[PDB]
Amino acid sequence: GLFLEDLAVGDRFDSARHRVEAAAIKAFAGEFDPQPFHLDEEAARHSLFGGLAASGWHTAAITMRLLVTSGLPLAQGIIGAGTELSWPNPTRPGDELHVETTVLAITPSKSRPDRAIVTCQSDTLNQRGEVVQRSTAKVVVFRRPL
Amino acid sequence: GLFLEDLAVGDRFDSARHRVEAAAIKAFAGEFDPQPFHLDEEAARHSLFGGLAASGWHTAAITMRLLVTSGLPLAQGIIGAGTELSWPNPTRPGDELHVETTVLAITPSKSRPDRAIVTCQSDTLNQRGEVVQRSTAKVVVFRRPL
């Protein structure tokens, strides 16, 4: 349960792991990203992904779950204002993902000194050390109440 | 079914609508963003959201679904390289969302002339005309095959 006072530029955090399976890729895709390359193994082969890949939005959702449950231990939760998002490598069925987060900057509110905008860079990696997602997010973090 | 040739800077696209309900907010949150403010109406009241709000990642997923099924009519699908994401206003239970997308720029690949990186700015709006999400994405769009 970390508050603003416990954070410092350069702090690194690590989440537990999550295994991505084919059926979970199709279940999420079927509901929020129903495109051939995320729904069918044959149709995916003939796409840029050349094989089943998870929706970037499915990888982003799994990243938030890992962040919330283990990766970013904020006592008052994770409240995002915005983020710079990129997916360098596809997320594949069978992949073990975990997130590595680094605090890049802390910028206290001039107007409201009991909180700051903390820039957190989360890199979601598979077992091969490749980055399947980088999210440079600005989170709102308050100091521990009195 | 649009291809690269059919696109031009300034083009506007509109998706069909989607209604966000409390149970769907909790179902998605419970799986990918299990935080009090997205799971419980009482706990949410005492948060910055002051009331149930959907996870920004749930709004992003719904945005992709709308884009895929109606908002961005790309013949070969929507393949994202990265995006600038922000959530100006919370997404609330009972909200009717639709997406308005604008092409801001088309930048052909020097190395691979059969494709271009198209900058698409999608604004997800509720019935009050407020923006619950803005995603300035770079999508990979190829011209129609021979």
mmCIF file of all heavy atoms in Angstrom, chain B residues 39-64, unseen atoms left out:
data_model
loop_
_atom_site.group_PDB
_atom_site.id
_atom_site.type_symbol
_atom_site.label_atom_id
_atom_site.label_comp_id
_atom_site.label_asym_id
_atom_site.label_seq_id
_atom_site.Cartn_x
_atom_site.Cartn_y
_atom_site.Cartn_z
ATOM 1 N N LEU B 39 -16.281 -1.438 -9.214
ATOM 2 C CA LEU B 39 -16.941 -2.652 -8.740
ATOM 3 C C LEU B 39 -18.108 -2.450 -7.801
ATOM 4 O O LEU B 39 -19.039 -3.260 -7.764
ATOM 5 C CB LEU B 39 -15.905 -3.524 -8.015
ATOM 6 C CG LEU B 39 -14.881 -4.256 -8.880
ATOM 7 C CD1 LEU B 39 -13.846 -4.982 -8.011
ATOM 8 C CD2 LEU B 39 -15.635 -5.237 -9.771
ATOM 9 N N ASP B 40 -18.047 -1.379 -7.024
ATOM 10 C CA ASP B 40 -19.085 -1.114 -6.036
ATOM 11 C C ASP B 40 -19.579 0.324 -6.041
ATOM 12 O O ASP B 40 -18.786 1.270 -5.973
ATOM 13 C CB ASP B 40 -18.570 -1.488 -4.638
ATOM 14 C CG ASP B 40 -19.607 -1.255 -3.549
ATOM 15 O OD1 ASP B 40 -20.756 -1.711 -3.710
ATOM 16 O OD2 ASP B 40 -19.275 -0.618 -2.530
ATOM 17 N N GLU B 41 -20.902 0.469 -6.098
ATOM 18 C CA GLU B 41 -21.540 1.775 -6.149
ATOM 19 C C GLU B 41 -21.307 2.620 -4.899
ATOM 20 O O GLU B 41 -21.205 3.847 -4.990
ATOM 21 C CB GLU B 41 -23.045 1.611 -6.454
ATOM 22 C CG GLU B 41 -23.793 0.640 -5.541
ATOM 23 C CD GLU B 41 -23.732 -0.816 -6.008
ATOM 24 O OE1 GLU B 41 -22.746 -1.197 -6.673
ATOM 25 O OE2 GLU B 41 -24.675 -1.581 -5.704
ATOM 26 N N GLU B 42 -21.186 1.969 -3.742
ATOM 27 C CA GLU B 42 -20.958 2.680 -2.481
ATOM 28 C C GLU B 42 -19.488 3.089 -2.360
ATOM 29 O O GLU B 42 -19.185 4.249 -2.071
ATOM 30 C CB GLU B 42 -21.387 1.818 -1.301
ATOM 31 N N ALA B 43 -18.579 2.143 -2.578
ATOM 32 C CA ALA B 43 -17.151 2.445 -2.541
ATOM 33 C C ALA B 43 -16.812 3.533 -3.582
ATOM 34 O O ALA B 43 -15.952 4.376 -3.338
ATOM 35 C CB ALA B 43 -16.346 1.186 -2.836
ATOM 36 N N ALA B 44 -17.492 3.527 -4.733
ATOM 37 C CA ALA B 44 -17.219 4.511 -5.786
ATOM 38 C C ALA B 44 -17.612 5.927 -5.368
ATOM 39 O O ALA B 44 -16.939 6.903 -5.714
ATOM 40 C CB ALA B 44 -17.930 4.112 -7.068
ATOM 41 N N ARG B 45 -18.712 6.038 -4.633
ATOM 42 C CA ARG B 45 -19.164 7.329 -4.125
ATOM 43 C C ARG B 45 -18.045 8.042 -3.351
ATOM 44 O O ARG B 45 -17.871 9.252 -3.483
ATOM 45 C CB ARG B 45 -20.364 7.133 -3.193
ATOM 46 C CG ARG B 45 -21.675 6.924 -3.928
ATOM 47 C CD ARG B 45 -22.704 6.242 -3.048
ATOM 48 N NE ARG B 45 -23.983 6.077 -3.730
ATOM 49 C CZ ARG B 45 -24.979 5.323 -3.278
ATOM 50 N NH1 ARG B 45 -24.847 4.661 -2.135
ATOM 51 N NH2 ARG B 45 -26.105 5.224 -3.974
ATOM 52 N N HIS B 46 -17.279 7.297 -2.560
ATOM 53 C CA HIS B 46 -16.216 7.900 -1.764
ATOM 54 C C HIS B 46 -14.883 8.027 -2.491
ATOM 55 O O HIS B 46 -13.850 8.244 -1.864
ATOM 56 C CB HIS B 46 -16.036 7.109 -0.454
ATOM 57 N N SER B 47 -14.904 7.901 -3.811
ATOM 58 C CA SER B 47 -13.680 8.014 -4.605
ATOM 59 C C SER B 47 -13.711 9.303 -5.425
ATOM 60 O O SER B 47 -14.679 10.060 -5.368
ATOM 61 C CB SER B 47 -13.570 6.838 -5.579
ATOM 62 O OG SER B 47 -14.594 6.890 -6.564
ATOM 63 N N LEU B 48 -12.642 9.547 -6.180
ATOM 64 C CA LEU B 48 -12.567 10.723 -7.046
ATOM 65 C C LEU B 48 -13.703 10.695 -8.076
ATOM 66 O O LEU B 48 -14.210 11.743 -8.482
ATOM 67 C CB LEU B 48 -11.232 10.772 -7.802
ATOM 68 C CG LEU B 48 -10.018 11.344 -7.060
ATOM 69 C CD1 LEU B 48 -8.969 11.802 -8.076
ATOM 70 C CD2 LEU B 48 -10.454 12.524 -6.186
ATOM 71 N N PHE B 49 -14.086 9.492 -8.502
ATOM 72 C CA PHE B 49 -15.155 9.306 -9.479
ATOM 73 C C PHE B 49 -16.507 9.668 -8.862
ATOM 74 O O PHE B 49 -17.452 10.002 -9.577
ATOM 75 C CB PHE B 49 -15.192 7.840 -9.953
ATOM 76 C CG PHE B 49 -13.963 7.406 -10.711
ATOM 77 C CD1 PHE B 49 -12.905 6.782 -10.050
ATOM 78 C CD2 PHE B 49 -13.844 7.651 -12.076
ATOM 79 C CE1 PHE B 49 -11.749 6.410 -10.736
ATOM 80 C CE2 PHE B 49 -12.687 7.283 -12.775
ATOM 81 C CZ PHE B 49 -11.640 6.663 -12.101
ATOM 82 N N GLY B 50 -16.583 9.608 -7.534
ATOM 83 C CA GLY B 50 -17.828 9.905 -6.839
ATOM 84 C C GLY B 50 -18.997 9.217 -7.531
ATOM 85 O O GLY B 50 -19.892 9.890 -8.045
ATOM 86 N N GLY B 51 -18.990 7.883 -7.534
ATOM 87 C CA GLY B 51 -20.035 7.114 -8.194
ATOM 88 C C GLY B 51 -19.425 6.092 -9.153
ATOM 89 O O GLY B 51 -18.282 6.238 -9.592
ATOM 90 N N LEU B 52 -20.182 5.053 -9.480
ATOM 91 C CA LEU B 52 -19.681 4.029 -10.378
ATOM 92 C C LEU B 52 -19.180 4.639 -11.680
ATOM 93 O O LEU B 52 -19.839 5.492 -12.275
ATOM 94 C CB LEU B 52 -20.781 3.005 -10.717
ATOM 95 C CG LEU B 52 -20.537 1.496 -10.502
ATOM 96 C CD1 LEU B 52 -21.162 0.711 -11.661
ATOM 97 C CD2 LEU B 52 -19.046 1.197 -10.389
ATOM 98 N N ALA B 53 -17.987 4.235 -12.094
ATOM 99 C CA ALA B 53 -17.449 4.664 -13.374
ATOM 100 C C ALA B 53 -16.848 3.412 -14.001
ATOM 101 O O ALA B 53 -16.481 2.460 -13.301
ATOM 102 C CB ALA B 53 -16.398 5.742 -13.221
ATOM 103 N N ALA B 54 -16.792 3.381 -15.323
ATOM 104 C CA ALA B 54 -16.211 2.240 -16.001
ATOM 105 C C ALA B 54 -14.692 2.420 -16.046
ATOM 106 O O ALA B 54 -14.175 3.538 -15.959
ATOM 107 C CB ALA B 54 -16.774 2.135 -17.432
ATOM 108 N N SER B 55 -13.979 1.306 -16.122
ATOM 109 C CA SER B 55 -12.531 1.345 -16.256
ATOM 110 C C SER B 55 -12.214 2.032 -17.607
ATOM 111 O O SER B 55 -12.925 1.827 -18.602
ATOM 112 C CB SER B 55 -11.986 -0.086 -16.306
ATOM 113 O OG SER B 55 -10.634 -0.120 -16.726
ATOM 114 N N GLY B 56 -11.169 2.857 -17.630
ATOM 115 C CA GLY B 56 -10.748 3.501 -18.861
ATOM 116 C C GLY B 56 -10.453 2.408 -19.887
ATOM 117 O O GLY B 56 -10.662 2.607 -21.089
ATOM 118 N N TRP B 57 -10.004 1.237 -19.412
ATOM 119 C CA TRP B 57 -9.681 0.109 -20.292
ATOM 120 C C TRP B 57 -10.916 -0.603 -20.827
ATOM 121 O O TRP B 57 -10.863 -1.279 -21.853
ATOM 122 C CB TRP B 57 -8.732 -0.841 -19.571
ATOM 123 C CG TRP B 57 -7.503 -0.114 -19.190
ATOM 124 C CD1 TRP B 57 -7.135 0.276 -17.932
ATOM 125 C CD2 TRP B 57 -6.510 0.393 -20.080
ATOM 126 N NE1 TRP B 57 -5.960 0.987 -17.983
ATOM 127 C CE2 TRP B 57 -5.546 1.063 -19.291
ATOM 128 C CE3 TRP B 57 -6.313 0.314 -21.465
ATOM 129 C CZ2 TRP B 57 -4.421 1.684 -19.846
ATOM 130 C CZ3 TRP B 57 -5.191 0.932 -22.020
ATOM 131 C CH2 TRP B 57 -4.260 1.605 -21.211
ATOM 132 N N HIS B 58 -12.036 -0.422 -20.133
ATOM 133 C CA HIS B 58 -13.305 -0.996 -20.566
ATOM 134 C C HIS B 58 -13.822 -0.052 -21.681
ATOM 135 O O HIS B 58 -14.289 -0.504 -22.731
ATOM 136 C CB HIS B 58 -14.277 -1.064 -19.386
ATOM 137 C CG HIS B 58 -15.597 -1.672 -19.729
ATOM 138 N ND1 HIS B 58 -16.697 -1.558 -18.908
ATOM 139 C CD2 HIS B 58 -15.991 -2.423 -20.787
ATOM 140 C CE1 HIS B 58 -17.713 -2.211 -19.444
ATOM 141 N NE2 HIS B 58 -17.310 -2.747 -20.583
ATOM 142 N N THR B 59 -13.720 1.259 -21.458
ATOM 143 C CA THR B 59 -14.115 2.254 -22.457
ATOM 144 C C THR B 59 -13.259 2.071 -23.726
ATOM 145 O O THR B 59 -13.779 2.136 -24.844
ATOM 146 C CB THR B 59 -13.950 3.679 -21.890
ATOM 147 O OG1 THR B 59 -14.873 3.847 -20.817
ATOM 148 C CG2 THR B 59 -14.242 4.743 -22.945
ATOM 149 N N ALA B 60 -11.954 1.822 -23.562
ATOM 150 C CA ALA B 60 -11.069 1.619 -24.712
ATOM 151 C C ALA B 60 -11.484 0.355 -25.501
ATOM 152 O O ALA B 60 -11.491 0.370 -26.735
ATOM 153 C CB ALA B 60 -9.581 1.521 -24.244
ATOM 154 N N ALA B 61 -11.839 -0.724 -24.794
ATOM 155 C CA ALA B 61 -12.267 -1.980 -25.443
ATOM 156 C C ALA B 61 -13.577 -1.803 -26.231
ATOM 157 O O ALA B 61 -13.698 -2.283 -27.358
ATOM 158 C CB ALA B 61 -12.425 -3.093 -24.401
ATOM 159 N N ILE B 62 -14.551 -1.125 -25.622
ATOM 160 C CA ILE B 62 -15.840 -0.816 -26.262
ATOM 161 C C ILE B 62 -15.564 0.074 -27.489
ATOM 162 O O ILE B 62 -16.212 -0.061 -28.534
ATOM 163 C CB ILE B 62 -16.767 -0.056 -25.276
ATOM 164 C CG1 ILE B 62 -17.281 -1.024 -24.218
ATOM 165 C CG2 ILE B 62 -17.932 0.597 -26.010
ATOM 166 C CD1 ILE B 62 -18.034 -0.339 -23.086
ATOM 167 N N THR B 63 -14.600 0.984 -27.367
ATOM 168 C CA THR B 63 -14.265 1.853 -28.489
ATOM 169 C C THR B 63 -13.747 1.014 -29.653
ATOM 170 O O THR B 63 -14.142 1.235 -30.795
ATOM 171 C CB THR B 63 -13.213 2.910 -28.093
ATOM 172 O OG1 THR B 63 -13.820 3.857 -27.202
ATOM 173 C CG2 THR B 63 -12.687 3.649 -29.328
ATOM 174 N N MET B 64 -12.883 0.035 -29.375
ATOM 175 C CA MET B 64 -12.362 -0.799 -30.455
ATOM 176 C C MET B 64 -13.491 -1.583 -31.130
ATOM 177 O O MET B 64 -13.539 -1.661 -32.356
ATOM 178 C CB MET B 64 -11.287 -1.763 -29.948
ATOM 179 C CG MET B 64 -10.637 -2.550 -31.079
ATOM 180 S SD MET B 64 -9.816 -1.380 -32.410
ATOM 181 C CE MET B 64 -11.155 -1.390 -33.798
#
